[PDB]
Amino acid sequence: QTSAVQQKLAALEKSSGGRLGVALIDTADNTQVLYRGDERFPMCSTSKVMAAAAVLKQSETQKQLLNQPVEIKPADLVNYNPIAEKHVNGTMTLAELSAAALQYSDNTAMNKLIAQLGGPGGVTAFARAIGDETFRLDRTAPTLNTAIPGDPRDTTTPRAMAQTLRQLTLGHALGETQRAQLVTWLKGNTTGAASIRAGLPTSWTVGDKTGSGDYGTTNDIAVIWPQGRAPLVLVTYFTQPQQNAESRRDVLASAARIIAEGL
């Protein structure tokens, strides 16, 4: 079948010139709306949620872990380091690195999370441990954002990512304390107002993580507390044919608007 919402999402996609992937979980009824839900997309920095959550899981058996100093060296800086560059030749804790990675999309911070997990494969191992058989992290930042069409590296499907983000933020993949910390971090994101947020009514609350990369790749994954409604989890992933394509955060906003109007 093609549902009315799917038909609208297809029309949006047709007019964007790229490829759109959407997955909604409505926790009012534990149902799912999917558009290219089983196709792979490059995650770009949306993968930082999985890395931060894996460190939060480690902290369940190490109560001081998030206060653990990590040295930041000049060689650690990469292409986008708004927080970490201030701490070169000093230290940041794993809490600080998690907050920087999630709320500012600091790539040096993400790389410290990855290193704490033993490399990209450690992030994938955490995904598997929480029931996500689809996610894969293969590279550090920034090369995880190359977003080359057809490349399986650093990809997931909308279905899998929605289901993971539910489990992490609303379910029991993390302990109580850790889940609340993750939600606090996502709600404090600085980078999201033009993406899913921009398609929703003002009164709805959002916590999200954006991503972008080559091929005009423009992504957002969110938990949403609508006015008067049980929470939603929404993944919107968008990528384009030309390497140098311009971000399209408006397409994500439009997808979110269609989903909101279809509840």
Binding positions for Ru ion, rule: CB under 5 A: 1, 3
Extract the tokens encoding 66. 């998030």
For the chain, what is the radius of gyration of the CA atoms? 17
Name the DSSP class of 198: G
Instruction: Select 35 or 238, whichever has its Cβ closest to Ru ion.
Output: 35
Catalytic residue, candidates 45, 59, 247, 254: 45
Instruction: Select 127 or 162, whichever has its Cβ closest to Ru ion.
Output: 162
Q: How far apart are the C-alpha atoms of 240 and 211, rounded to whole Å?
A: 14
Q: Give the containing element (helix H, strand E) for 41.
A: strand 41-42
Instruction: Select 7 or 177, whichever has its Cβ closest to Ru ion.
Output: 7
Q: How far apart are the C-alpha atoms of 27 and 170, rounded to whole Å?
A: 9
User: Which residue's Cβ has the minimum distance to Ru ion?
Assistant: 1
Dihedral angle computed from the Cα positions of residues 184, 186, 191 and 194, in that order, rounded to the nearest 10 degrees: -110
CB of 32 to Ru ion, least distance (A): 11
CB of 33 to Ru ion, least distance (A): 9
Instruction: Select 1 or 203, whichever has its Cβ closest to Ru ion.
Output: 1
3-state secondary structure of 74: helix
Q: How far apart are the C-alpha atoms of 197 and 99, rounded to whole Å?
A: 20
CB of 151 to Ru ion, least distance (A): 30
CB of 1 to Ru ion, least distance (A): 3
Instruction: Select 3 or 79, whichever has its Cβ closest to Ru ion.
Output: 3
Q: How far apart are the C-alpha atoms of 130 and 180, rounded to whole Å?
A: 17
Q: Let me know if 45 is a catalytic residue.
A: yes
C-beta of residue 233 within 8 angstroms of C-beta of residue 225: no
CB of 6 to Ru ion, least distance (A): 7
User: Which residues are catalytically annotated?
Assistant: 45
